[PDB]
Amino acid sequence: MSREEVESLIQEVLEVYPEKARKDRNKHLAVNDPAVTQSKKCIISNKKSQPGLMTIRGCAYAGSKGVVWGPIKDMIHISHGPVGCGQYSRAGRRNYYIGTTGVNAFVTMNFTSDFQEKDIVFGGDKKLAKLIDEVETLFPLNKGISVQSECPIGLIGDDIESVSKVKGAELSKTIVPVRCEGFRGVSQSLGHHIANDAVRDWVLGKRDEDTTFASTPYDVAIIGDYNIGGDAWSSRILLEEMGLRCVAQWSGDGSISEIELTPKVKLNLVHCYRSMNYISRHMEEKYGIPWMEYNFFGPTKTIESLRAIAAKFDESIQKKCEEVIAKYKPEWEAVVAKYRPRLEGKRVMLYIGGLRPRHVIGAYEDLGMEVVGTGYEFAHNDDYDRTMKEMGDSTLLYDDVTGYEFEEFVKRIKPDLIGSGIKEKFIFQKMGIPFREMHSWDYSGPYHGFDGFAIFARDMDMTLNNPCWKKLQAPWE
Amino acid sequence: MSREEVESLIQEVLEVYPEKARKDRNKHLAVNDPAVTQSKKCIISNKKSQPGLMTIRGCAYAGSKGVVWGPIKDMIHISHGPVGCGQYSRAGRRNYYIGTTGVNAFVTMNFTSDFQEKDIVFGGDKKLAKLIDEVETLFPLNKGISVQSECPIGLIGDDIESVSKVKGAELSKTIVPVRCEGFRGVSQSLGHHIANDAVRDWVLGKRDEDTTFASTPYDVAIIGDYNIGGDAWSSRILLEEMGLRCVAQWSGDGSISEIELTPKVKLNLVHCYRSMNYISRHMEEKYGIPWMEYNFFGPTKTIESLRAIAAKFDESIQKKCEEVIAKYKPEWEAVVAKYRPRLEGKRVMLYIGGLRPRHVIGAYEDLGMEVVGTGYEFAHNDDYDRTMKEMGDSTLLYDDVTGYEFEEFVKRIKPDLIGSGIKEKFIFQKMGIPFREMHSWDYSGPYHGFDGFAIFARDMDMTLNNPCWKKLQAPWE
Amino acid sequence: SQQVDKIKASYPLFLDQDYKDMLAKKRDGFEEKYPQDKIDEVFQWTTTKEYQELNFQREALTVNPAKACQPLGAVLCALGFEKTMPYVHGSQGCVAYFRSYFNRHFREPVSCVSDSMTEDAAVFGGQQNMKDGLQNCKATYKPDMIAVSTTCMAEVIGDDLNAFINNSKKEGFIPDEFPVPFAHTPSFVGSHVTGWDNMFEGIARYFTLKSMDDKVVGSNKKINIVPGFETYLGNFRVIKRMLSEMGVGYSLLSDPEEVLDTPADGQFRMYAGGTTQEEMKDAPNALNTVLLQPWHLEKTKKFVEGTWKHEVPKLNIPMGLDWTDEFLMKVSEISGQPIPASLTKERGRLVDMMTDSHTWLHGKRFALWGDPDFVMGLVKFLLELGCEPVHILCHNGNKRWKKAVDAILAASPYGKNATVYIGKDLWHLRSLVFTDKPDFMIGNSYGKFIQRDTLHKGKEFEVPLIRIGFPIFDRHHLHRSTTLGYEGAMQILTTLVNSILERLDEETRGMQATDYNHDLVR
Amino acid sequence: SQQVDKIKASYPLFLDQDYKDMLAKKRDGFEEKYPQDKIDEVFQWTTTKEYQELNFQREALTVNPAKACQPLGAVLCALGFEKTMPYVHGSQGCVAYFRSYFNRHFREPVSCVSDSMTEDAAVFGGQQNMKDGLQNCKATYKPDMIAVSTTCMAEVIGDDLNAFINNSKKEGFIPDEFPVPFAHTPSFVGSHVTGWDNMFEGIARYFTLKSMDDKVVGSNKKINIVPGFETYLGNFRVIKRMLSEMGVGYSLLSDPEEVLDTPADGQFRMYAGGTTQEEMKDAPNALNTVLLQPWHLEKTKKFVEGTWKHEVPKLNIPMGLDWTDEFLMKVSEISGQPIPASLTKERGRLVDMMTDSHTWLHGKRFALWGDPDFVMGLVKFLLELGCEPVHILCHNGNKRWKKAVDAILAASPYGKNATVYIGKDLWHLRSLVFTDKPDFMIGNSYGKFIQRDTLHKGKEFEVPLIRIGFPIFDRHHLHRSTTLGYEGAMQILTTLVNSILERLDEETRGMQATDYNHDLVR
Ligand code: ICS
Ligand code: CLF
Ligand code: CLF
Ligand SMILES: [Fe+3]
């Protein structure tokens, strides 16, 4: 459907760049074919961003501290380096938790070493040890400490692994060094890899010799769900209504004891493939734990995922799954009956990094909405392999898109709604186009599960059908 | 001082008026002579205001509805007539009370008949009866109704007495008609008189045949204390600490049952002579109850009043009075030690309607402050008889002062502080002179008693030594 | 007992144990108070729908009204003219109440005089009072003009203003050339806005009725602006600023912004600014006249169309986005002058704030009350924001205004759950907020008590109050705010969205109970 | 479960019984949570004075800081020039954080680019990254100037900015005449305000260092205004308005008000307004230069005095009455323009509001934090109102600034109980407000958590937060406010008095318990 026209637009947008930038960016733009299975033949991903083209990507510190390690509530995470990092990453991601902040819970706080010139010149290992002692003194109820390195830690010759070992042996405390310097990798994904490596190396094997935890055949661990707006909770109740026992969830509202007890479960339900497939494969290799991906965005994907998960178990779990589906059918049917007529036929362009862009399409299709263009800030070729069969014929695909490219694509295609990060929200609100911020979910939610689908539909309706969008043109002009 | 200067100033201020207004207003201004105990030979009061000179006086409805009857918490007071009267007087006076507003207490509520053209032309007695029925329907826990007349009630010949009698007989309810039309009298004073007469006629004698109330030789009634900012409460504790039992409290936080029980007390302690001397004399004539005036403004006056009151009883009450004085002595001594050095030598001018211009002098002298001028809105010659002995020689006295007169007097004397109502506050704040509202205490207090003295001293200090008064002149003029 | 280092006012010193024991002893001994169980039962009954059905059957009793009487509006109108003393013919208690009420709202000196009529005048009328009052006021406060209104006293006794002023002039109490316009303002008809309309119509008639022969429409290249009863100086300021930005010649009739905002520089200014007598005399020479609040300016509209022969445009109050646009376009059409780029940028910035706050403002339920024009402008703006007004109250409203508001509501899907009430008071509104709970109230200070009652039913039933309207007594300097134009819309939007966010923070502040939603960023 | 008619978001959806049962089972089964009694004991311990003594002995650990790093201030300074792109040499995560952080504060688009240095640049440097980034940015976003700051990466590896830009120019990546100023903004020295100062000094040096031969002081009859790190648009507006009313020629260098307040009208404007290159080139011809925030514009002051030969006045921030008066008098002295009557009337109106609200403001105790200049100006204004600052915190302050603030406090009797803290974070402040409880806090959004902790100790121990400063993330459109001059003083005074009154109403809303002081009129 107008595949040549999408290809033409790509060329006209590429015309502006210099030759090297154009040649690099041409490989990150594609027209989707549902029949193509290998995405490497059409789109390139996981590459360095071109200098000075205003990318959306973050750093490895954001992928490790801000995504994987931050949601762990009972541990204290130290931003090792200058003050800016933890300050800009403090409480910006809505990873929800239950606890007494400052006493047993520390997600929303900013622990930092705050280097000055002298720490840069003479190193900061002694200062890190003194900081660890001060943390122990002032925060006795913590259950572990993580040391998230920033750029100078890698640049200067700090060795925080030995300090972590010595202090942990001295204090009988789990101290996990994470070399997540922002200049490593090209995006947040290598931060995910480094964080998972740290998890396997320092935390995961504490209770390997311990067999005091009673286990049941119905033990699963939720992996890769960070409880954004409560999302993980909305999933967990469903799994507990199906007759399953959720030992751990990674890592929203997560505790270190849950991570240590994870190797005792019978199944690993991985929600975010991109950030936790590493630890999932490690557990499959070392403990024999099978892991499977699932989707809880929209009633259709939720029902399919529940049925598959129950198929991994015996007949009683399957019967409970059928009971849960029958119980929740009228609610999402009412949601559909109320909101589909006001969203049918609308077109959406989504830019998000890693899992979300192909992973929320089913919920839009449940509302009768068509995604015409989907993009990933830092995904890999396997994510696009899933995306191509997830998306429709002649749709736009785009990896690590620049601001100019995305603005031109939006001007040409003219969608009714854009789902993207805040750095795009106000740009496209001033363009007269409804915008929904997927990462914080416009500070609403949750959207996972049956209870989340209602909120999702309500929010899409309230933003798309907003009376403000008809008032940007002055009556005299 | 300079009595001759004060008289010449009075003449120069007098010069502006026309001949008739000049001749009339000349009799209302005076130079104080403490030896002169007959104010009639020196000042005239309780007369009609000259038209167009912007007087401060209110009306009889304000004297009856807003002062005497309004504080009665368990009764409902209907402002009979057009809508403005009760709206401007709703919750404007800080007559504090304890209760559940709208269920058993109705002080801060505005009940009115809200006449239209048809009520004016055809009368409003039927509307009054229907209103009484509706009041009984929606407010079952009310314990009596008062009907406060406004100007058209007296001007259209409505008969509220017959309606009140019929409805009270029908509903077994106490309904008190009050002919407090604003055109009656010259000020709120006749409102006080009418309100006291209606209390005598319809409320006071309901329990004359009732003897089931147990009485003690220490029974007193606080008369003429309207609990402004809790004033009466700060009084009552002291009386209760001296060993007395306070049956009733007229009328701040007062109840109709307390008024009915008042004829059973042994002594009537009158704070406001001007508004309650009528009922005090009536009760002395009819029940043989003695009444005496007291003053709880400032430590000296309250100590004198407590000793004089205890002198009316046996020796145990006197011993308890001395115990109370000894208990409270260090607190007000500390208040004096803290605040008198900050206020020593300052000069104040006062203008309040009755009683207060003279009772607040003692506390000002307790803080080492001099009152150089005082006056009343609606006082009588007896009030000035009491006042002249308590003020200094060659101090200015003035009755129903006009805005122009008071402004010129302030410009010439140049006092350090002015204590008046809300209609002079911003006028004299714009002139650069500190101002204290002496009706509502600048929304603070209470000022009665030992506890009130600390608040009074703190407020006077905070207003008089405020830095903002040193900043009205811009540095470039 | 008081500690000299930390002195306690009434709150919380009455919370001390000795004071509590005293109050309990007083209550149990002599107050004969109803048992607490009965009081709770009665309150719970007053929260119910049956109590609401009884409450709306009221025909004779009014509890807690939301309107004032005519001479208050007459005084507000009269203060808008230069060196003009307000003169209320009748009883002095009315003037005392008016002065105190405006003092508490504006927190400024407010000047007015009375002729202090008494029972003698109640029998023989007030000729002598009027003569003496005019002479005394002119000699004492030296006004350039004296505007005369009436209390319900003189209205009931039928005092003739025109005859009294004429007899005063011909007997030499005041010069014959001294301007003394008059207006009858019966308090038993209409409300304060009606008094404003009557006073302004009287002044305009006095200055223009007998000099229409030499007047040519549009000969001074200006537009007359009549604001009506307004208690926000920011509204006058924003109208003047918008007209000056457009380069429109204008004459703001009855402009009291200066006399209500005098500086504190060591002297008292009884008069400041205001509309000049020359402006009122030259008013018939304007191109046209704009009424900012047409729903309480009907008599003035009749006079202006019938005598000045100005084709008064059919404009709503310039509140919100679309009505401000319509006002600007009508001004541009009448003056023949284009709309400048600054106003376009301001409108775009208002739209930007709307798009920024739409997610938090969507679907919220509001009760609201006030004067008709303000109420309808607020309802229009709320519909523009995607909000849902549910209880719309206007005590001083009429039936035509009700149809206009219903027509406005029907034009929007967000007004489907809205009912318009005229002639109802704040006790009706209390019943409505208890039986059909909205998210917020919008009104004057009198709504605070309503909030109290709802908090007594429970924290989950409390309806927060947003103080927009007149009068506001329990907050400082809110009379400096703006409701008109893009600036006023911006201020209103900010107040609404931040009230919503403040309530959300209050509801999610409990540690380990609801603080999971205590988000840093909103 | 969800009801379609009334859908609940996370609050209060997770307060349902099934979700509470889920969370209880989760916590009891797998979280190994500490017992509630131990948690309560530890919290109570952390609210004590011994915990405060332990907390103030910290030397290596920083908990909840109130400052940012230099490139953020550099970017914000760079955004204030006409059609100019902020270019940050280093890693892209820094730019992502800067953009998101300013987007959450201003709720507006913020444009900034990085050259995306990686592990390869850690050993070879960033010459090629600089060349390609400059060429790509110029080709793509078409900016007139590129202002280049640094991340801590390039600062540690010792990248030479001047050599990089020169080699880029000589090899044809960018035109030779094309303006590319640079500034080293290392994150481990100073804070964001230091980055703003460095960026501005770099731009001024780039435009004026090599063309001082034909410059004559005072020949253009203008006054240069350097605002500094300022996140309130109203401050730029009010400075321009106050200079324009005086009829004073001025040049505002680094003016970002337009680019951060673009209208929503169907198009996206990446650039808007800003200081032109001609203005920067002509700046040395001004009569003098005024630094609005001297305490973090020291390097700029040194360069201005050394090179432009301007006798920079020793002025404090124009916050509050006295310092606004001093600023106006200095401007009048420099330019020769007398102070107009409108400013006199505005000052008098501010004095009038002070006199009106003094009774409610007197004696109130405040904890407070922010940037040095803003903190000292706010403390000065608080002392002017008779309020008592108790805990004064400035994480990025120095010893000279602390001495100046101490001297200011000694000049007023209301500073007798004040203490100034430098180098302390918000955990220190939490301890301070637990052990010596003030009436209110004044600071940015990060203080909300502190308030939460206080409410966890008890309602009588709760310290409400007042959002004045940067950043404000949990309220909408507060960046449009004003804190400078008479208008800013008026706004801050209104906010303070209304917060006090709102707290009083909250404390006095209890039926039959505390509602005796719930006065209608305050
Ligand atoms: S972890 Fe990843 S960018 Fe999988 S770094 Fe990012 S809370 Fe996104 S699309 Mo912010 S791979 Fe999670 C994500 Fe997805 S922070 Fe959240 S929304 S599902
Ligand atoms: S890519 Fe990532 S966010 Fe950037 S620094 Fe590197 S780890 Fe950190 Fe913190 S301090 Fe500031 S923001 Fe940087 S420049 Fe020095
Ligand atoms: S002196 Fe006193 S206050 Fe005056 S009216 Fe008379 S009783 Fe009343 Fe209410 S309605 Fe308005 S304010 Fe009057 S003019 Fe008709
Ligand atoms: Fe004032």
Ligand SMILES: [Fe+3]
């Ligand atoms: Fe915006």
